Design a protein around this ligand. Structure first.
Ligand SMILES: [K+]
Ligand SMILES: [K+]
Ligand SMILES: [K+]
Ligand SMILES: [K+]
Ligand SMILES: [K+]
Ligand SMILES: [K+]
Ligand SMILES: [Mg+2]
Ligand SMILES: [Mg+2]
Ligand SMILES: [Mg+2]
Ligand SMILES: [Mg+2]
Ligand SMILES: [Mg+2]
Ligand SMILES: [Mg+2]
Ligand SMILES: [Mg+2]
Ligand SMILES: [Mg+2]
Ligand SMILES: [Mg+2]
Ligand SMILES: [Mg+2]
Ligand SMILES: [Mg+2]
Ligand SMILES: [Mg+2]
Ligand SMILES: [Mg+2]
Ligand SMILES: [Mg+2]
Ligand SMILES: [Mg+2]
Ligand SMILES: [Mg+2]
Ligand SMILES: [Mg+2]
Ligand SMILES: [Mg+2]
Ligand SMILES: [Mg+2]
Ligand SMILES: [Mg+2]
Ligand SMILES: [Mg+2]
Ligand SMILES: [Mg+2]
Ligand SMILES: [Mg+2]
Lengths: 62, 127, 46, 201, 239, 142
RNA sequence: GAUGAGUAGGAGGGCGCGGCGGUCGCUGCAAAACCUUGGGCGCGAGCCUGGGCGGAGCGGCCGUCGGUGCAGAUCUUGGUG
RNA sequence: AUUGUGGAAGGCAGCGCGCGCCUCCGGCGUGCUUCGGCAUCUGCGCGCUCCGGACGCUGGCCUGUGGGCUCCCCAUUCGA
RNA sequence: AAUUGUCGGGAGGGAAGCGGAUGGGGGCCGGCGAUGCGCCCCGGUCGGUGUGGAACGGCGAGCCGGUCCGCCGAUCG
């Protein structure tokens, strides 16, 4: 036996991909998956994460 | 055709998982069912009892779904579908669908010989 | 602006495998040689 | 050039002399003088169209740096040693060890006259080396090798004569030791109460 | 003459050689850095080996000197402990459970080093029946780190197959080779905290020859508590 | 396709008339694609005959062991009847192999499909020989 | 690289049944159902196939839908020890 | 005694032989030394090895009374 | 399907069945297990640089190509 919680596994859930089936959004995700990986830019990483988010997590801007 | 697979197939278990007490009762079929009972000794995994299937029994991903002949099966219903395996004849073997007529099986078998595609049941209903 | 495009080593016991030990501690060879030579002198002296 | 190794090994993979000592023995100091106070620098040592293209890329095994070494010879086994065969049709018979072939197998003789065992190859793992030694100085088997026992039934007369030539030189040595002829003519066996792990050979 | 190479292919090919050139330079630069490091670690290991022998002979001389004058020489108190968990994870009181976690002893027969100070000693006193510990000698530290030493890199357990692993984490603290790591642990140097935490808790095997009685203190003939220099005898049978 | 190929792949990768799936969507699942311009008949963006402007077709042509080598014209993506640039080859395998290498890799048409095209040509050519004469070796050794 | 207990309970990914919109097929040279000490695949729900019987229909795949999965209820109806 | 997972790399590490001579188990030059020695000179080329996970050889057998089996019946030891 | 007869195989000292492991006896399985490959010459068969046409293509007016037919040379594959 090992004295850990849930076998040392994470119990947190985050979006690793968009829930939408929009083909154009998935192309944008593919574009910014590449940009984030091959540049290490913090801007690209933030953009990639926000493309996964639900509608209420992407509120409009007047 | 020479099979591409080279790693030996290791079956963690060859016996089937029989439903508990399917021997006792005719109405209880052998197809596996997880026992949900509160006192179920099988559910509680007492030694000397029926074993339950779990993910630990999973076969090696490299040898999974490989037939003893060293190929993976693909079911074919006509000559056209057989041609899909031309470029995978070292990985996939064809099996003619159970309901194909004997007349159409001759065409499939003849075509498979030209493409060097293995047929698992090429002798079916030709007598 | 893209950066340039980019298996586990079987662990061996250095206490038994000489080359593995020398890879980690190059001075181990000098210690080994001196111990062997020192013992040889004592055996000859006796 | 140098006639003997500069650095004898105390153990496998460890030389007797250190790097500083070897620099003196290598003579790099002398080489430096002859080349204007510099160690000379050298230079690195400077098809048919396929008839069929495989659909699946061929995989080649990774390189293995381990090379097989010649089969070792048990210390108990020395030329002229009497061996006991433990398996095969000649199980239990006592034969005379002549030499070890390049394949690592042992070359043995009955001799054929005494016990009917001809020049034969026996694996070292299936024999026991006794303490009895018979002189084989006059025995010449330089002509015998692995190819002499290779297949390609009547035994050709050439091999029968070859057996007798080797056998003849060995009979005289065997006859010198009293009771050795009978010893080589009888098979070894275990009787009641005979414990192999306590027997001296 | 010949098919004209498209501009896209030329641009990609031009950049490939530039990356290859920069990549090729790293081997030359890294190779020279590696060559100098081999001399450095060789001399440090030679220096450490001399220091260990001097300390052993220095202690013997002082004890003999006190004997000649008719007095006593009190040996310096042990600075380093090795702790091994001897009880399982069943029926754990909450306080003991927390302390063993802080010591990174989450599994029976796991082992770790621990610096000696009043704060740590009092924690250890509160988990006495669940552990056994003592003063590890140089041999024990070498065998543990060399045979069962794994480094924590980015919260991952990495075998200490090469000195590069040690340098990747402890390089900024001056520890570049496994010999430096051994020296830091044995002497409890200024960077002991980082060096010791870098070591994953040692996954020892069940003792060869077994235990006497895990339920009793070592003083009573059991296996729990402080056994001082006799921890080494147990380290041989568990490593 | 008339639209970007990447967009087409997003649409047809889930369902199209050429998609052949068997054994469900678990571990047993096997997927193939049977469009004529898919060299390996694989359901992937690389080999897809629907989501690429530049595609290679190699298949038997009519009679007399003729092999068709057709490539899609880049400027005719909206003209199905004139999309293919057909070239019927009825010479030795070596001559046919050079032609495929010239029309696929040398001109930078689809260099990533050069290996597949040559294997596809090799498979098609071999089957034509067996059809004319018949099976003579089982090809089971090794 | 680490890790693996689970009632009540939650969730995910899958299996199976019957329609509908599509798509790809099979069948009197023998469909469905049923039978089998034939064989094989999957941890498993299940799936594929040989042989037999039968004599006219049936299946795969994508989407979508539902009166959609039984060992129990002194369960219902029928049949049988 | 158990075991070979991987299939892209001759890398890393430690040495040997050449690039200078001798009487060749060794000897011959600076620096340091506890006078035993020393990663002080120890670079290049070509090789070797306990060195980024097993390779090699031989035999048997291949329509047989052979081999294999997850199928069937049964027996036995353990469990139940 | 429950259940029953019959023939055949087998077992049985106050239940039987069941899990795991082998063995005995059955039954079943030729993709249950290969026989090719490389290099030679004998013969047979089938196609071969440079110029002509036919229908087209890649790159973007112009360069760069293959396929098919015919004619020379070349004389191999
Ligand atoms: K349908
Ligand atoms: K069946
Ligand atoms: K449906
Ligand atoms: K071994
Ligand atoms: K056989
Ligand atoms: K039993
Ligand atoms: Mg565990
Ligand atoms: Mg849990
Ligand atoms: Mg199974
Ligand atoms: Mg309960
Ligand atoms: Mg049927
Ligand atoms: Mg307890
Ligand atoms: Mg552990
Ligand atoms: Mg013991
Ligand atoms: Mg005890
Ligand atoms: Mg207690
Ligand atoms: Mg669980
Ligand atoms: Mg249905
Ligand atoms: Mg039955
Ligand atoms: Mg279905
Ligand atoms: Mg309805
Ligand atoms: Mg209902
Ligand atoms: Mg019911
Ligand atoms: Mg129920
Ligand atoms: Mg009732
Ligand atoms: Mg009733
Ligand atoms: Mg009644
Ligand atoms: Mg392997
Ligand atoms: Mg019945």
């Amino acid at each position: 036996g090992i004295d850990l919680v849930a076998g040392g596994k994470s119990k947190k859930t985050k979006r690793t991909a968009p829930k939408s089936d929009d083909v154009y959004l998935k192309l944008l995700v593919k574009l910014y998956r590449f940009l984030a990986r091959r540049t290490g830019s913090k801007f690209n990483a933030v953009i990639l994460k926000r493309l996964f988010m639900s509608k209420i997590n992407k509120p409009p801007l007047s | 055709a020479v099979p591409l697979l080279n790693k030996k197939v290791v079956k963690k278990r060859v016996k089937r998982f029989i439903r508990p007490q399917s021997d006792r009762r005719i109405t209880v079929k052998e197809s596996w069912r997880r026992p949900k009972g509160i006192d179920s000794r099988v559910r509680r995994k007492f030694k000397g009892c029926v074993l339950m299937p779990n993910i630990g029994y999973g076969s090696d991903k490299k040898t999974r779904h490989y037939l003893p002949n060293g190929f993976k099966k693909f079911v074919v219903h006509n000559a056209s579908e057989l041609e899909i395996l031309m470029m995978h004849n070292r990985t996939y073997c064809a099996e003619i669908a159970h309901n194909v007529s004997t007349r159409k099986r001759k065409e499939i078998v003849e075509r498979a010989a030209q493409l060097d595609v293995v047929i698992t049941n090429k002798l079916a209903r030709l007598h | 602006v893209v950066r340039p495009i980019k298996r586990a080593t079987l662990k061996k016991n250095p206490l038994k495998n000489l080359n593995v030990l020398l890879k980690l501690n190059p001075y181990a060879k000098t210690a080994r040689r001196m111990s062997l030579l020192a013992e040889a002198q004592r055996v000859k002296a006796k | 050039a140098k006639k003997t190794i500069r650095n004898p090994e105390l153990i496998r993979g460890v030389g007797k002399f250190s790097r500083s000592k070897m620099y003196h023995k290598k003579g790099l100091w002398a080489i430096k003088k002859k080349n204007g106070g510099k160690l000379p620098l050298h230079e690195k040592k400077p098809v048919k169209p396929p008839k069929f293209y495989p659909a699946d890329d061929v995989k080649k095994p990774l390189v293995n740096k381990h090379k097989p070494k010649p089969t070792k010879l048990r210390a108990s086994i020395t030329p002229g040693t009497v061996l006991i065969i433990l398996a095969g049709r000649f199980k239990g018979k006592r034969v005379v060890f002549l030499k070890q072939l390049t394949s690592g197998l042992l070359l043995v003789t009955g001799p054929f006259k005494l016990n009917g065992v001809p020049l034969r190859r026996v694996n070292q793992a299936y024999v026991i080396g006794t303490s009895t030694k018979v002189d084989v100085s006059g025995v010449n088997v330089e002509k015998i090798d692995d190819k002499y026992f290779a297949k390609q039934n009547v035994l050709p007369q050439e091999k029968k004569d070859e057996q007798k030539t080797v056998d003849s030189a060995l009979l005289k040595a065997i006859e010198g030791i009293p009771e050795l002829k009978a010893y080589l003519s009888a098979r070894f066996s275990l009787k009641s109460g005979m414990k192999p792990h306590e027997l001296v050979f | 003459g010949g098919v004209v190479v498209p501009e896209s292919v030329l641009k990609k090919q031009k950049r490939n050689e530039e990356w290859a050139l920069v990549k090729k330079q790293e081997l030359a630069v890294a190779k020279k850095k590696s060559v100098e490091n081999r001399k450095l670690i060789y001399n440090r290991a030679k220096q450490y080996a001399k220091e260990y022998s001097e300390q052993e002979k220095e202690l013997i001389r002082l004890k003999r000197e006190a004997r000649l004058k008719g007095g006593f020489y009190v040996d310096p108190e042990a600075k380093l402990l090795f702790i091994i968990r001897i009880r399982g994870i069943n029926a754990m009181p909450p306080q003991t459970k927390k302390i063993l976690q802080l010591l990174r002893l989450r599994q029976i027969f796991n082992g770790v080093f621990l610096k000696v100070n009043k704060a740590t000693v009092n924690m250890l006193h509160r988990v006495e029946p669940y552990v056994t510990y003592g003063y590890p000698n140089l041999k024990s530290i070498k065998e543990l780190i060399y045979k069962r030493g794994y480094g924590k890199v980015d919260k991952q357990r990495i075998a200490l197959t090469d000195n590069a692993v040690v340098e990747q984490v402890l390089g900024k603290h001056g520890i570049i080779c496994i010999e430096d790591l051994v020296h830091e642990i044995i002497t409890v140097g200024p960077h002991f905290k980082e060096a010791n935490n870098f070591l994953w808790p040692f996954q020892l095997k069940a003792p060869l020859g077994g235990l006497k009685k895990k339920r009793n203190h070592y003083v009573e003939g059991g296996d729990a508590g402080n056994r001082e220099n006799f921890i080494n005898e147990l380290i041989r049978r568990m490593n | 396709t008339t639209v970007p190929g990447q967009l087409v792949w997003e649409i047809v990768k889930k369902n199209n008339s050429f998609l052949v799936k068997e054994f469900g969507n678990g571990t047993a699942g096997v997927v193939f694609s049977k469009e004529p311009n898919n060299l390996y008949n694989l359901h992937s963006y690389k080999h897809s005959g629907l989501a690429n402007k530049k595609t290679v077709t190699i298949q038997p042509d009519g009679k007399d062991k003729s092999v068709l080598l057709a490539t899609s014209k880049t400027k005719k993506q909206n003209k199905p009847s004139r999309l293919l640039n057909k070239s019927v080859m009825k010479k030795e395998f070596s001559r046919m192999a050079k032609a495929v290498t010239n029309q696929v890799g040398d001109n930078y048409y689809r260099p990533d499909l050069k290996k597949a095209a040559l294997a596809r040509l090799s498979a098609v050519h071999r089957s034509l020989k067996v059809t004319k004469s018949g099976a003579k070796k089982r090809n089971r050794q090794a």
